[PDB]
Predict the structure.
Amino acid sequence: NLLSDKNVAIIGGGPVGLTMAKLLQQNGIDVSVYERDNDREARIFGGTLDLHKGSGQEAMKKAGLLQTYYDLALPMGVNIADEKGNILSTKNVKPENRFDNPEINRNDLRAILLNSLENDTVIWDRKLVMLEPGKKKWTLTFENKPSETADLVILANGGMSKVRKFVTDTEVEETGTFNIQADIHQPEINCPGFFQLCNGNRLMASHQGNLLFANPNNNGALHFGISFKTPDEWTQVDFQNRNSVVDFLLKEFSDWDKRYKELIHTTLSFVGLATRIFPLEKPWKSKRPLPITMIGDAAHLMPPFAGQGVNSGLVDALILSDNLADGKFNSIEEAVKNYEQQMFIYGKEAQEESTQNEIEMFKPDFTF
Ligand SMILES: Cc1cc2nc3c(=O)[nH]c(=O)nc-3n(C[C@H](O)[C@H](O)[C@H](O)COP(=O)(O)OP(=O)(O)OC[C@H]3O[C@@H](n4cnc5c(N)ncnc54)[C@H](O)[C@@H]3O)c2cc1C
Ligand SMILES: C[NH+](C)c1cc(NC(=O)CNC(C)(C)C)c(O)c2c1C[C@H]1C[C@H]3[C@H]([NH+](C)C)C(O)=C(C(N)=O)C(=O)[C@@]3(O)C(O)=C1C2=O
């Protein structure tokens, strides 16, 4: 093993960093995960994730966690609707497709990963702020906590990682769209009309440049997203004030059936975020002081409009761990390089599809 008298620091305990830690730990490699979250019960905001056969599910299979993923995940139909609430198309789960890509809740996935690892693999309340290369080890700086050291740092700390300079100078870019997200609890009570329009399936509608998506059953909460081209005026809506977000959305959704408006009216709080991409446009630095790399959204953040996200990141996990597993290479450096080479190819394919589908969907006359 290349890592024999060494240790690995994974920065970030997302699904990709925790899968990374598991695939390494089952090969006897000494890894820690350093996670900003205060403790393992912190709520992860967001929709559900779906792991695909051939990618995500391969990583889970390699981890021995596939069946656990299946047990906790929920396959779902898809309804496409118009702005008037007409169902244009219903695609139900067929028994033979049940396992293709079942929806799992993000805390549920994290709990599966965390349970899979040895005790104290993950070190909570650790926010990496600085990285410094030493003689033979990285020194790792964490806000108000002891510093630590590692032979190999894997950055897994998501799309907005601030500690990427030693791998690449490339910067995150805005793509021109924007997403507003929210949860509604007791959706059967609080948005009955909309809840009944979803009728146990996911829901998508498209009208005049505004896209609505919803999953009515993320562990009992409805999660919806509203996406659109960033208005040129923007920020001129304040996501801390629910009144200004409501006003903006009721204006944009004036044309839409009352059931969708009710959705907006009953939401307590909204999260706004500009869509971003970390583009795989140019090779990463070949001159590097010590072995360091990136996986997941740290490596290839891309728009979430073709289901590309976590799966390609799980594949990074699989490919990197296989590579670091063997004496197949002469050096950690070579193992990292080979991984980075494959990831550029399937990464860039994914980003091309995200971008392309993003262009496609926000064409004024788009129809699902
Ligand atoms: C609105 C939206 C919808 C999406 N829908 C889908 C979808 O349906 N399907 C899909 O596959 N993908 C989807 N994605 C993308 C998906 O969420 C990401 O690909 C996935 O979560 C990336 O996993 P990750 O582990 O690389 O990063 P993350 O999930 O971002 O996790 C990074 C982890 O690092 C921790 N961290 C951050 N900074 C630090 C630090 N300095 N020190 C220590 N720890 C740190 C964070 O706490 C977080 O725990 C969506 C994305 C968005 C924005
Ligand atoms: C083209 N759109 C419609 C699309 C396509 C695919 N599938 C593919 O691209 C598959 N690629 C093939 C066709 C196999 C080559 C898709 O897989 C998806 C989507 C839509 C998104 C919407 C995402 C959204 N994000 C942007 C916040 C969101 O709010 C929700 C939600 N439930 O509230 C989503 O579900 C969303 O995350 C998501 O998962 C999408 C798709 O999965």
Q: What stands out?
A: The pocket of tigecycline (ligand 2) is lined by residues 47, 179, 202, 204, 213-215, 223-225, 227, 304-307, 357, 361 (CB under 6 Å). Residues 297 and 355 are 15 Å apart (CA to CA).
